[PDB]
A paper describes a structure:
The human pathogen Mycoplasma genitalium, a member of the pneumoniae cluster of mycoplasmas, binds to eukaryotic cells by means of its adhesion complex, the Nap. This complex is formed by two heterodimers, each consisting of proteins P110 and P1401–6. In addition to their roles in cytadherence and motility, P110 and P140 are immunodominant proteins and constitute the main target of host antibodies during infection. Here, we address the structure and mechanism of the Nap adhesion complex and reveal an intricate interplay between P110 and P140.
Crystals were obtained from the extracellular region of P140 (residues 23–1351), both alone and in complex with the N-terminal domain of P110 (P110N: residues 23–827). The structure of P140, for which there are no molecular models or experimental phases available, was determined by density modification techniques, starting with a mask derived from the sub-tomogram-averaged map of the whole Nap obtained by cryo-electron tomography (cryo-ET). The structure of the extracellular region of P140, with a bulky N-terminal domain (residues 23–1243) and a small C-terminal domain (residues 1244–1351), has an overall shape resembling the capital letter P. The N-terminal domain consists of a seven-bladed (β-sheet) propeller and a “crown” formed by the clustering of the long polypeptide segments that emerge from the propeller. β-Sheets I to VI each have four strands, while β-sheet VII, the last β-sheet in the propeller that connects directly with the C-terminal domain, has only two strands. P140 and P110 share many features of domain organization and the topology of the secondary structural elements, suggesting a common ancestor, although the degree of conservation differs for the N-terminal and C-terminal domains. The N-terminal domains, with an RMSD of 3.5 Å between the Cα atoms of 359 structurally equivalent residues (∼28%), are markedly different in the crown. In contrast, the C-terminal domains are closely related, with 74 equivalent residues (∼71%) and an RMSD of 2.2 Å.
Residue numbers in the entry: 56 to 262, 266 to 782, 787 to 1158, 1166 to 1347
């Protein structure tokens, strides 16, 4: 009854969620603990029915019971050669036993007899026997100790569960009517309420003072507590003089009406908590392979989701709200935007009742009361952040043993990921084992608290990324964990991270909602696009202006100094006289704040800089955290603090400082930074991140030059388009260098970044890029104010009007406006000395890098490909006329920070790049008619969750498979200066690159014996899309990369002075009707078709050959002749034929026969599945001397202790040839005999034969030493 004899029907496999296939067992008894599975099919989970009656849980238990009788799993133990020894299958173990311990808790063990067994099965055996082992980790200090990760059989078959139980968040109704993306979207802008105009903010009365002006006085925001239990004496922030459009029923966000067939998680956090079998379990076990009783159980601990949820910030109990409170609530609410910092509507995966609470109602604070001064008071909530099935299992995987603790960092979330869901690891789980691992304690800490100490100096690449938080942890980082590994002596956590929300940071002017549909949908939670969409016309000058100040200038005529359509040209100067009169004239107090009449405004960069959760030099510094990203939008690797992780307490105690104010009066005088009270401990968790990386070690404009240098996986063509002829030759997508015209440097705008003390040995002259604004071809050194916003009733803004002028004490009334403004306001604008005019930003640059490697950056489409809607490049695209409409720069609706036409060219949408016959797909900036456009995908289906397992390459480098690219971090551990610090190896198998679910061909990455990292690919294992409904329908098809891009509609572009002013849109709610042709291409398959792809390998992909000098871009970083960004563009261009020299290249491939399921890795070998494990040729001549052949007299008569060095525990060099048979003329020094056990009394000498491996000069066990193993006992004729 060899209960755990190797079952040949089982074969290795890799779990999708973590990419574990085998654990490399180190130490005295090396080998591997590899996952192993039954490969029976014809399972129909369809057989298990749901009789409406009882619930999801009732259905699940039934599925697990079904699968219990169908599927089979174990973890088999392999010897150092790769040969299987024993299986250990929990379901088929009849008599499982816990290990016997001492009084100290130390297990009872003899190296030969094995473990002492209690004969009692481990705790909760009946629930846990049926669970599937998905990960094995070995204790570093304690020997024979290992840890198994168990998940329900259901967690595996998650995607195959009933369509009505496991569904997508995007409702697709069975209608063959017509496709309108905006149909689900709330697009009707708010209107003036009339009911109460007493809710409109008041001007200040009065106040010698030198400067004065006729400009409309500041608006006072007064807040006074008074003596009332439920009411405030004054509460101006609550004042809402606007209201939702009334279509005989309000145009507002209602979860009841909108989510009729609402997305809900498989199980609530409490269900997973209660139902022992439905959760992940970690079982501590013992293992000595060459011993008799070789397997024994230890400690069985269930990973309670409630243990993580307990340690969430108190901010998270009320996530439909934020520290800004009621002013921001009404403002977002009215603007048909999601409220809070983590709204169910945006991320329902984390809410127990999913989409059911997907609105702004009941935020935990009184809102919309009949009397506004009763608003903003703490009321009852029913919408906290939790950890449902979906998000929970996404956080199950990647476990590491550090000292007396075991940590679970989570997986890539693929186990529960749907096309419209983003389940991710919210934090770390830790089982703290005590008393020789006889006692345990389970706890969970969210990443948000562990990452609180994040500051710019920790990174060496892009700076000011939205990863900052505050006392109320409003930034909620989540991960698609690659792994946690030791890179040398440093603990690295890698994968992809969810940055702060950057694309919804700007806020619209209450009327501009229907013109800016794409942007509205991003705030609405409908368009799950994390990238910044460039639709700036409609933006309000500031996102922080309260509703009371929105109707000071309704007609617009006054250019409302308070609230107006964001335009950096009509912004005020920083001259003392301007500031003195418009700002310092009004002074804020204890009970008063002012809506200043100083004209503030700026583009993307500026809006983000002031209202995003940017990183600074101080932690918990973000006064503004807009929201959190939908999908992981950043590459991320971080050196963690082992001592903190192991040291930190289980329960984290927050203080009143982590809680939102109980009323708008307390809230009014909130200090952003508060000192933790001595009874709390929350503060101690903030600095677990010592350092971090986010990609290559480049910043701002310099970074863009690299973005171009890298190619697109689908094409093999770079974003640069630099290889060539003609003067109408394609321009780069990300760079500004040699694009447009070279403008001249002067006019530093704010923060007194003056200098001028040290002038460089060159002219710094900045290129405008594409979509620039020039006075004349001759005059390209600034733009006179005369190319001004002439907005209301075509009556231009007059800069010298009484209100737009200030006069100091003495006279001569001068205007507040600027005389000249920068030569670009396009998405590709990069003005170093004009933040307010810059659109290009690091938060976008970061996303763009991840997204260019995933190759999923969207393109704006005007003309489809169809016979009557074409784009003839030769005629409609003039690369030299970027200044005009012939440059086809949208200037509205495109991805911010890039030139759409160059991206389209790169993608081969128009041109020979992808299709040999020009697909003629593009954007025509038309001077004859109103333009109707929509963003579309590239045609690739890679997601930012397509994160493979972590591979340590050496004591200073590591990497992982991110989509089709294998990224390696060379300059993270010991960062070499002048080196870029990234190596990218692209996949070659096109059938995978373009595939519908491409990451389903991925079967893990592994570092090979040769030294290079390799990745398993199996295109036969590519999962096809859900089902060919009808013939194959007639509407949109949800794919992993599928997005719900809304139509943008702009007026006809000008023939001359096109991008002098911002591009003006018009209503587009209706516009979908004619885009039938284009709207068709919102579905991946259709673009794949037009590009000549989709319809018609299998092996291992090795990375590019890198050397110590590889990555040395120092020559390109020199600021000798040109500014850093220019010198790098020149350098990259010179190195275009040898991209390999930098670290960019095509990963070489080796063909393999049959389906690849995983690898079995022992310190000696990596065998794909169980490829030919052979006996070691080096040791084949070494063997123990048979019992009879022993001398007996020589020092075996006298005590055993005399045969080995007590300090070292090795048999003295002299007796070694007495016990082992060696080939004639063998080096005695290349073999050793460790004493495993001895009995002076019983005259027994237990040994293990070790041999110095010729490759690594370490001793390996001579597995062929005995019939049993490298172990044997020597005893006199007994």
């Amino acid at each position: 009854k060899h209960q755990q004899a190797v079952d040949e029907t089982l074969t290795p496999w890799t779990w999708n969620n973590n990419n574990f296939s085998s654990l490399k067992i180190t130490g005295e008894n090396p080998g591997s603990f590899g996952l192993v599975r039954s490969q029976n099919d014809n399972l129909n989970i369809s057989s298990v029915t749901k009789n409406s009656s009882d619930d999801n849980l009732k259905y699940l238990n039934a599925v697990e019971k079904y699968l219990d009788g169908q599927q089979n799993f174990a973890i088999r133990r392999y010897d150092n050669n790769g040969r299987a020894l024993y299986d250990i299958n929990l379901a088929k173990m009849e008599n499982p036993s816990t290990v016997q311990r001492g009084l100290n808790g130390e297990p009872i063990f003899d190296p030969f007899k094995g473990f002492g067994l209690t004969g009692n099965a481990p705790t909760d055996w009946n629930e846990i026997k049926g669970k599937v082992p998905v990960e094995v980790v070995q204790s570093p200090h304690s020997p024979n100790l290992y840890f198994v990760l168990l998940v329900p059989k259901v967690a595996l078959e998650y995607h195959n569960l009933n369509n009505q139980v496991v569904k997508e968040s995007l409702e697709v109704k069975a209608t063959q009517s017509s496709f309108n993306p905006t149909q689900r979207l709330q697009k009707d802008s708010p209107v003036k309420d009339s009911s109460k105009q007493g809710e409109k903010l008041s001007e200040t009365t009065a106040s010698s003072g030198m400067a004065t002006s006729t400009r409309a006085k500041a608006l006072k925001v007064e807040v006074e507590r008074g003596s009332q239990s439920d009411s405030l004496l004054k509460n101006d922030f609550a004042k809402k003089p606007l209201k939702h459009k009334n279509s005989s029923g309000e145009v507002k966000l209602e979860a009841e009406k909108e989510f009729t067939e609402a997305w809900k998680p498989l199980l609530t956090t409490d269900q997973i908590a209660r139902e022992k079998g439905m959760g992940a379990t970690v079982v501590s076990f013992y293992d000595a392979p060459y011993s008799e009783n070789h397997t024994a159980f230890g400690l069985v601990d269930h990973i309670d989701p409630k243990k993580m949820v307990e340690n969430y910030p108190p901010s998270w109990k009320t996530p439909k709200w934020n520290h800004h409170g009621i002013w921001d609530y009404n403002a977002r609410n009215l603007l048909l935007q999601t409220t809070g910092f983590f709204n169910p509507r945006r991320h329902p995966e984390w809410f127990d009742e999913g989409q059911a609470k997907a609105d702004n109602t009941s935020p935990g604070f009184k809102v919309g009361d009949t009397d506004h001064k009763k608003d903003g008071f703490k009321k009852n909530s029913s919408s906290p952040i939790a950890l449902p099935f979906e998000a929970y299992f996404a956080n199950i995987g990647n476990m590491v043993a550090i000292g007396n603790s075991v940590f679970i960092f989570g997986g890539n979330g693929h186990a529960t990921k749907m096309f419209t869901t983003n389940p991710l690891s919210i934090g770390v789980f830790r089982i703290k084992y005590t008393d020789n691992f006889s006692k345990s304690s389970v706890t969970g800490w969210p990443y948000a608290v562990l990452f609180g100490g994040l500051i710019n100096p920790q990174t060496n690449g892009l700076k000011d990324l939205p990863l900052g938080t505050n006392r109320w942890f409003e930034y909620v980082p989540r991960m698609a964990v690659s792994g946690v590994k030791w890179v040398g002596n440093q603990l690295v956590l890698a994968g992809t991270l969810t940055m702060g929300d950057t694309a919804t940071v700007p806020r619209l002017k209450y009327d501009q909602l229907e013109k800016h549909l794409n942007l509205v949908a991003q705030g609405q939670g409908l368009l799950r696009e994390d990238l910044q969409i460039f639709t700036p016309y409609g933006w309000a000058n500031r996102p922080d202006i309260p509703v009371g100040a929105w109707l000071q200038d309704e007609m617009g005529s006054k250019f409302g100094p308070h609230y107006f359509l964001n335009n950096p040209d009509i912004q005020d100067n920083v001259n003392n006289d301007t500031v003195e009169a418009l700002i310092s004239s009004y002074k804020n107090t204890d009970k008063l704040k002012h809506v200043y009449p100083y004209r503030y405004s700026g583009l993307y960069a500026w809006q983000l800089f002031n209202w995003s959760n940017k990183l600074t030099n101080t932690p918990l510094s973000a006064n503004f955290v807009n929201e959190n990203s939908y999908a992981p939008n950043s590459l991320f690797a971080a050196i963690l603090n082992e001592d903190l992780l192991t040291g930190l307490s289980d329960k984290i105690f927050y203080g009143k400082e982590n809680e939102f104010a109980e009323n708008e009066a307390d809230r009014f005088n909130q200090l952003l930074s508060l000192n933790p009270n001595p009874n709390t401990n929350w503060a101690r968790y903030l600095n677990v991140v010592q350092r971090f990386t986010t990609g290559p070690n480049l910043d701002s404009s310099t970074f863009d030059q690299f973005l171009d240098f890298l190619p697109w996986i689908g094409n093999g063509k770079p974003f640069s388009n630099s290889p060539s002829a003609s003067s109408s030759t394609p321009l780069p997508t990300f760079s500004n260098i040699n694009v447009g015209v070279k403008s001249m440097i002067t006019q530093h705008l704010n923060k007194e970044n003056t200098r001028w003390v040290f002038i460089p040995n060159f002219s710094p002259d900045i290129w405008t890029g594409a979509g620039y604004r020039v006075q004349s071809a001759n005059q390209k050194n600034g733009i006179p104010f005369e190319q001004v916003k002439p907005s209301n009733n075509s009556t231009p803004f007059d800069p010298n009007s009484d209100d737009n002028k200030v006069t100091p004490s003495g006279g001569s009334s001068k205007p507040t406006t600027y005389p000249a403004l920068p030569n670009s306001i396009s998405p590709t604008s990069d003005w170093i000395n004009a933040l307010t005019f810059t659109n290009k930003n690091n938060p976008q640059r970061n996303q763009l890098l991840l997204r260019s490697l995933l190759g999923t950056i969207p393109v704006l489409i005007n003309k489809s490909g169809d016979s009557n809607d074409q784009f003839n490049k030769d005629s409609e695209q003039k690369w030299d006329k970027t200044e005009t409409n012939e440059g086809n720069l949208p200037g509205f609706g495109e991805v911010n920070g890039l030139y759409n036409a160059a991206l389209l060219h790169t993608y081969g949408f128009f041109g020979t790049n992808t299709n040999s016959t020009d697909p003629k797909i593009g954007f025509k900036a038309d001077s004859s008619s109103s333009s109707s456009s929509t963003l579309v995908g590239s045609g690739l289906n890679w997601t930012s969750q397509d994160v493979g397992n972590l591979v340590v390459i050496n004591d200073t480098s590591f990497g992982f498979q991110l989509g089709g690219w294998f990224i390696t971090f060379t300059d993270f551990i010991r960062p070499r200066t002048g080196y870029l610090g990234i190596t990218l190896s692209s996949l070659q198998d096109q059938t995978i690159i373009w595939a519908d679910q491409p990451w389903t061909s991925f079967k893990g990455s592994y570092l090979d014996s040769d030294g290079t990292p390799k990745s398993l690919w199996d295109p036969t294992a590519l999962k096809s899309l859900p089902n060919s409904s009808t013939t194959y329908d007639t509407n949109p098809t949800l794919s992993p990369s599928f997005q719900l891009y809304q139509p943008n509609k702009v007026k006809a572009y000008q023939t001359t002075n096109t991008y002098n002013k911002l591009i003006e849109p018009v209503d587009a709610t209706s516009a979908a009707t004619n885009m039938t042709s284009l709207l068709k291409l919102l579905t991946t398959k259709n673009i794949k078709a037009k590009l000549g792809k989709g319809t018609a390998g299998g092996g291992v992909s090795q990375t590019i050959n890198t050397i110590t000098t590889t990555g040395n871009i120092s020559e390109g970083l020199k600021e000798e002749t040109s500014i850093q960004a220019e010198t790098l563009k020149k350098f990259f261009d010179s190195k275009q034929n040898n991209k390999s020299e930098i670290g960019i290249g095509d990963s070489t491939f080796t063909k393999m026969d049959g389906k690849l399921t995983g690898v079995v890795s022992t310190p000696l070998v990596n065998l794909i599945n169980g490829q030919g494990a052979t006996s070691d040729s080096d040791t084949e001549k070494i063997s123990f001397k048979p019992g009879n052949q022993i001398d007996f007299n020589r020092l075996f008569t006298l005590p055993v202790t005399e045969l080995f060095d007590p300090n070292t525990m090795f048999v003295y060099d002299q007796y070694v040839p007495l016990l082992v048979n060696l080939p004639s003329g063998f080096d005695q020094a290349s073999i050793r005999l460790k004493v495993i056990s001895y009995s002076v009394e019983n005259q027994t000498l237990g040994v293990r034969l070790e041999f110095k491996d010729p490759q690594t000069q370490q001793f390996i066990p001579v597995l062929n030493a005995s019939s049993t193993g490298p172990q044997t006992v020597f005893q006199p004729f007994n």
